[PDB]
Design a binder for this molecule. Sequence first.
Ligand code: A16
Ligand code: A16
Ligand code: GLC
Ligand code: GLC
Ligand code: GLC
Ligand code: GLC
Lengths: 144, 143, 715, 143, 143
Amino acid sequence: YVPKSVVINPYFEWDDEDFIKGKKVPLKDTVIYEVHVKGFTKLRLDLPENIRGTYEGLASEQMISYLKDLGITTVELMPVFHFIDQRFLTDKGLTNYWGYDPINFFSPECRYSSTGCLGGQVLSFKKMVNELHNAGIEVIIDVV
Amino acid sequence: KFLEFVKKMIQFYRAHPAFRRERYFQGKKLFGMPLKDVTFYTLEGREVDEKTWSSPTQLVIFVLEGSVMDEINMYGERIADDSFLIILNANPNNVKVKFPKGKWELVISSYLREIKPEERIIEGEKELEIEGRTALVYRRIEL
Amino acid sequence: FFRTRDRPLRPGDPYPLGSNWIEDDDGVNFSLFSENAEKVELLLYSLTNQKYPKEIIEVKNKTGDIWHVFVPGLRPGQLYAYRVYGPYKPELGLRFNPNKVLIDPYAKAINGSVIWNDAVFGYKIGDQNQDLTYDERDSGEYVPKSVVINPYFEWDDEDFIKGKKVPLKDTVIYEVHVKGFTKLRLDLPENIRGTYEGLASEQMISYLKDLGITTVELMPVFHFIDQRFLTDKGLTNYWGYDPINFFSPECRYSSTGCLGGQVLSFKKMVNELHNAGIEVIIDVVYNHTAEGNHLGPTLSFRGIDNTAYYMLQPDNKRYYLDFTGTGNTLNLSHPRVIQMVLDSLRYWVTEMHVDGFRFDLAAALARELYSVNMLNTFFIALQQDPILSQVKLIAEPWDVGQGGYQVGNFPYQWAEWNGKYRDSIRRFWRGEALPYSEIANRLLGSPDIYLGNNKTPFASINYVTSHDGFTLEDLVSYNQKHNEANGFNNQDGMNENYSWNCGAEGPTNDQNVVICREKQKRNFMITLLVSQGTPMILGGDELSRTQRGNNNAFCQDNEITWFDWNLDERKSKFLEFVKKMIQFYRAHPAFRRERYFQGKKLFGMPLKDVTFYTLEGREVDEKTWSSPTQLVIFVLEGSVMDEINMYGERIADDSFLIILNANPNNVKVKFPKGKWELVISSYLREIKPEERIIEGEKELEIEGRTALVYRRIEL
Amino acid sequence: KFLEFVKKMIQFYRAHPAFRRERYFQGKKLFGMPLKDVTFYTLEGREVDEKTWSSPTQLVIFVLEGSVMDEINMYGERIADDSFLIILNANPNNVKVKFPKGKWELVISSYLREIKPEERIIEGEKELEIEGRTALVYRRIEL
Amino acid sequence: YNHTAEGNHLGPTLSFRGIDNTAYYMLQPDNKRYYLDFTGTGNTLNLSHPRVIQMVLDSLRYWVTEMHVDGFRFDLAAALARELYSVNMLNTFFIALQQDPILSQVKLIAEPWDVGQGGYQVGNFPYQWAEWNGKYRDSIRRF
Ligand SMILES: *[C@@H]1O[C@H](CO)[C@@H](O[C@H]2O[C@H](C)[C@@H](N[C@H]3CC(CO)[C@@H](O)[C@H](O)[C@H]3O)[C@H](O)[C@H]2O)[C@H](O)[C@H]1O
Ligand SMILES: *[C@@H]1O[C@H](CO)[C@@H](O[C@H]2O[C@H](C)[C@@H](N[C@H]3CC(CO)[C@@H](O)[C@H](O)[C@H]3O)[C@H](O)[C@H]2O)[C@H](O)[C@H]1O
Ligand SMILES: OC[C@H]1O[C@H](O)[C@H](O)[C@@H](O)[C@@H]1O
Ligand SMILES: OC[C@H]1O[C@H](O)[C@H](O)[C@@H](O)[C@@H]1O
Ligand SMILES: OC[C@H]1O[C@H](O)[C@H](O)[C@@H](O)[C@@H]1O
Ligand SMILES: OC[C@H]1O[C@H](O)[C@H](O)[C@@H](O)[C@@H]1O
């Protein structure tokens, strides 16, 4: 019944990475944009389904362009620590949508990964941050 | 049409240092200028006093002196902006505010209606009516 | 209700000109020259909506005569265009129309083309005071938008070809139309047919590698517009010789299109070519624009700053000096225009990795006000430039204006198109008898033309055919020009085509005719590829390409100009001939020379490096040399050449004997001493077993219209 | 002593953006501020009128308004400085000068003697004796 | 760049005079045995020749990319604009220099004149060009 832990290959090429590292958004000109990875883009038929409401969906041209337009500088994602659906929510045909119930502190929630679930959640995440930084956008994660 | 409003508001915030500050406003004149970096007025035309400052209200009105700011960048330059006049009216009814000296082009508001052609400037300490639940920002273009 | 200053901005930089994705400051830097404008507006558009500005920024900073702004948040891909305000006074040259949306003359990508519409003209069209009037219809929705780009491209295998490449001296040029090349090549999947990507495909790369050419000269690939008068005829600008921007590659050749993908699609093509050991020379139009004269549209330069850019009637300044014959001529005297042209050249060199340029209507670049000057500013700057001093420069040595015939007059480092060569050689085989001189000279790299200026046979670009005029097929397939499909009542195209039908006009069945044509084709081909200098093949003549006697198919974007790859016996058996001829030229130094032949014995040898004989067996004399002829015959002494390589070795070849007979009738030539195996000819028939050697000063009969090369294997 | 002085003076130049300008002072106010970025005065308070701008002079005096300059760094920030009051008496004799309104502080002069304590701070349109061949820079601490 | 140590005629023959005398030096157009002297040092380099112009520009680029100099102050800069007999500030040399990728980024200061006739060229210099202000020098001295 309990999911299994996955050993991973931590190698990821942060192309264009390193330069944003560097006189970025100071707190003083920052404008924060609190987003739910899924809710962001679930109903965005603008993208092909199956990246709707995932990381990959969040860091797409379409979306990146939106945020760039909107004019926000940093995005604060809701909890992305792998979390569980409380039973009392399950027994009601319900789910933990917000995610504020972490079970592990190092793994990104699998239910947002387009690639899933086996190692692809962390790969899918890194690309998203990479993609964002390339666009001059900070990332702040809600942390439980 | 609101999306458009949030976009333009954000751009406003970003284009203006007098709102992205690393230091607080004190209530005084700095650098030997004849103005305050900030000033809180009453509903006519009047700097706030110890009593009006403690007593409640639904109408806030305040002036930020772009030029007399104590904001320094990382290169040791001080950092002028423009002088603004923010008029916040939460009063359910309308009110009549008296503008402080100088001349005051309109920039932004709550009004969803065609901005009356007599609201787009204010001169000479004269005054103007403001529908309840309304926010207005003004830019002094001459003092 | 905001201001131009409630939007986050920076003052930006005057340099470079154009728009620059500055990764580090997450924004774009917009630079635009104009010394006459009173105000400038940056117009930002979006993918979807292109009828109106998404946003309007006013360029408020200006260092000297250069307005500059930096908008945060803009990245690559962002569409933009320019409004320019200023004085409108067509009497004085001032033609500012801020209603007219303009293209950034420094754009490296341009979105669509122009949707033709009166509103793009900035005078009232139907008005009686044409071009004196001031039309104030917004034209945004019709003019394509400039695209900001990401210049990063990984030139894999790039850097090494950079490096002892094709010297002008062993070069063999192949003039091609990117589209026409490969439109009718079902060998590739469609949608790269007639694009860059199509040009640099395995299939094609292998073709060129086979054919044996070393460098390819692409027709104009500067983003260009279709003249309205061509549009209003259901027609197109197929050739492209009407540029509107000097930095952007034409979108109509990009497979990826059109948004940034034209320049990406181009770079890959050059990359792909270099990997195959192939140079790239682009046809370049710098002498005129697509804005034509007055009455013409207002798209780019006319709006931004008309006083510059454009040569104006100095007494009027309302009309345009036109030495190009296309309505206007670029003011190559204004510092900013000289910079733009030069930038463009450097841009296409260091950025797009071009290897050389063929300048169209060169002379137009050496114009001051009414006079030609091969020593104008522009040329001298071009000559001292560290980057450009290294690339191949080739010239159409003439413009159309008065006194614009500049053959032999271009500064060193320039090769010029030899129009003497083409005309003469064409009239020689035709049948005409020219003085033995006028042809021997041609055959020897036109020393008379170029040796008076310290140039070498390199500088002479020899060619029989070209995009201008007939094809090689239609050069032996016609006497007059059949350009009725152009829709100018056949009132365009050169009248003198120095051509001949071989006794007809158009396609034929008469075998005696076809045979003639097939012969001549090989007479031409033997010549070009045996004359000193640098030979140019017209792309397709190895396919016997036909334009149905259209000698001016500039607007024919169709089957008329399409490459036809369907090869029967005849068409293909010739392909084989061009291949073997080219290989011959390449395998033999005695034809790829850095020095001219003098007429003497060198290095203490008993022979001449060259020798011109008569019809029997006899060195030419002062009189026979000046008197006409239709039979040229000459010996090149491989061994007694003054050719040194870069390592200081002199360079033997074999001794040849070229016999050119343009005489319509047969003749009997007496072979000079020694023994003379046959190699190549015009004969389509089984080579007679008594023609395959000649000994002992004896003699042989030669059918008229026939070329023969011989190799002395014993003396 | 001179070496030292040149040092201190170069250090001053480079401290204050009002002198390392990228654009020219205009003769007028700016950014809707009362004070004008640059002003010239005469012996007495009255601003340099017309014929006084043409007629010769052995005495120059002018006030730079650091807080109302049209100066923008490469980041789109208006710069500001201090407000300074230059006195250039090239005249060989002494002269009395009337400071403009504010309250001023002595920053540097060409005086080799110790500066009298009543030159260190001028106030309220007050007057000051200026020896001939003497140059003085002043900062307005209050207004 | 404006003149050589080979003086006029009667001068020595060391370098240019000897390599090409019709190329490097502005010769009296009526004589060509005498040297046009706009510098006062015997001779004048003629930056109207394609190879002369190339050498000066080569040199400039050499000291920049090779010696990592940050800019030049040209001595008698005006004599560099003499092309024919007069100062054309629109000459080939200056134009090539303006459009040059490398020299485009460096500093270019000028002695804005020469000893020549009508050589005084204060303020007429191309942009990015700065000028030694001779009028300042004098005015301030006299003040
Ligand atoms: C060298 O440069 C030439 C001019 O740019 C090229 O010209 C060829 O293409 C031109 C568009 C064409 N223009 C004229 C056509 C006609 C009638 O035939 C008129 O109606 C137009 O107004 C003219 O502009 C030239 O005739 C044609 O030769 C040349 O191909 C390049 O190699
Ligand atoms: C600018 O350029 C000037 C000339 O190159 C410089 O000139 C200074 O040095 C020169 C060598 C000197 N030459 C003359 C001296 C005299 C008499 O004093 C004559 O006998 C010579 O024949 C002259 O050539 C100049 O007088 C001197 O000012 C200047 O310093 C540079 O800034
Ligand atoms: O004026 C234009 C003409 O100039 C020269 O005569 C060229 O040789 C010719 O080909 C061209 O058409
Ligand atoms: O003006 C054009 C003519 O100039 C010269 O006479 C050339 O020799 C000739 O070939 C050319 O057609
Ligand atoms: O001709 C050269 C002279 O020109 C001017 O008179 C300058 O003021 C002077 O300093 C310079 O030496
Ligand atoms: O002798 C020096 C003077 O020479 C000329 O007259 C100049 O025009 C002048 O500005 C300069 O002061």
